[PDB]
Symmetry: C2
Subunit: 269 residues, 2 copies
């Protein structure tokens, strides 16, 4: 029942209720048995009970969220939004430093934590959050920690460089042979580089140009997340606002890809 625009707005409502401070209002946005991965790569968080345990100390640290303009998915459930986070070091910082994500500051009472994360929200038809994956890693966080997940981060930027030059074969060198490439998420995926070569052949055909915002990884680097802005010149110039999620294999190749972009994310220029 919920279309792209309404899920897009509910995502912004989530970030606004995080900034208000009302804890009960945030928990009301989730399903009673909802699952939360914050960060992705760590064990999830299930239930309203566990959600108060996760969001209460964040509100104590005065979490402030500048949210990007969200994008939706063509599957009636998914909306994705980027979250620029700032917060006081206490009380969440000490836990981050214990896990090895920050280095403890000299003044833990005046320090601040900056964080860039990409949320992948799944909602049912009623607006309730059934699942929220929040992707961010050490290179997406202050403290001083990038352990050559940078090399895995760069894979998201190498794709844009190769496809901008027409090097179709170099683009295919970034993924495994069993590549599953959902684009857009909601339509049936392409499987095998034979299918993907057809896709990339048609990209350079109508002259696409890709520009990625700084990517983010999961806390275990199995996923690289890319917000790109694809511009095509044919049929007549257009602009795409997309967020993609690659799953990396053992050796850092592209296993599965989920290009999230909705109908309301294309624009006439």
């Amino acid at each position: 029942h919920m279309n792209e625009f309404a899920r897009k707005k509910r995502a912004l409502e989530h970030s606004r209720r995080i900034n208000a401070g009302d804890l009960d209002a945030i928990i009301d946005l989730y399903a009673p048995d909802a699952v939360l991965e914050d960060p992705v790569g760590l064990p999830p968080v299930t239930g309203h009970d566990a959600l108060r345990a996760h969001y209460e100390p964040l509100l104590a640290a005065h979490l402030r969220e500048e949210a990007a303009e969200p994008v939706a998915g063509q599957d009636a459930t998914h909306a994705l939004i980027q979250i620029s986070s700032v917060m006081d070091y206490l009380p969440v910082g000490p836990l981050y430093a214990e896990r090895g994500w920050l280095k403890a500051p000299d003044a833990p009472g005046t320090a601040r934590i900056h964080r860039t994360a990409m949320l992948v929200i799944r909602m049912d038809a009623s607006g309730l959050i059934r699942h929220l994956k929040s992707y961010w890693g050490t290179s997406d966080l202050s403290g001083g920690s990038a352990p050559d997940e940078a090399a895995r981060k760069q894979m998201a930027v190498d794709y844009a460089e190769r496809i901008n030059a027409g090097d179709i074969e170099g683009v295919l060198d970034l993924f495994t042979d069993d590549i599953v490439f959902e684009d857009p998420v909601g339509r049936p995926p392409m499987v095998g580089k034979d299918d993907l070569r057809r896709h990339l052949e048609l990209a350079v055909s109508c002259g696409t140009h890709e520009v990625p915002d700084p990517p983010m990884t999961s806390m275990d680097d199995r996923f690289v997340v890319t917000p790109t802005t694809v511009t095509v010149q044919r049929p007549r110039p257009m602009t795409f606002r997309i967020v993609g999620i690659v799953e990396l294999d053992e050796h850092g190749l592209g296993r599965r890809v989920q290009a999230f972009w909705g109908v309301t994310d294309v624009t006439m220029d």
Copy 2:
């Protein structure tokens, strides 16, 4: 750019002044040394002298035009509009009847002549008609006038039937190996049956479905004029309004195609 809007307004104005009847008001639209081909395939018409003479017998027969929504070209000069007209038989009637374009009616004082034609108007920076082409043939005229013109008119529909079916090879057979495909008119033209396949492969993938209006020809059956309404499903639904001008060789294949459609002729839905 939206100087196309201006060129479209003048094309309607030319049809509006033919409706008016003031022979001088109509000619104030043509440049001093303009050229008119009405019908195309017949010797040209240069200067206001032969312009006052070409429109005097037609304005006498009480010529009235019914104009369709015009279509501009992406080259700053052109504007195309479909024109349906009706007029009295006398006095221009016996001229068409002598040429073989009509049969003489049994009551020339009451009879009327209907016409469907495509106006191709080339203007300058000021807006004066420097060169106007009017495409219409014998099957585009009343009376009773042939099995080949029908066949040459059909390829405008066979092109549409095969592209909606995904028959890329069947579309390519409709043209010569010399084929120059100006799609759109203005941006660089596709040359060769391999530059065309790339465009057609991009077409079937975008989901193009074309439905043409009843075509017209030139009086010599060398040009076929196809007004189409082309719709694509991907990346996202939009509708084009093109008017194509096809150049046919001796054996009946298309050697040069001019797909006139401006940036002001695309609409999302």
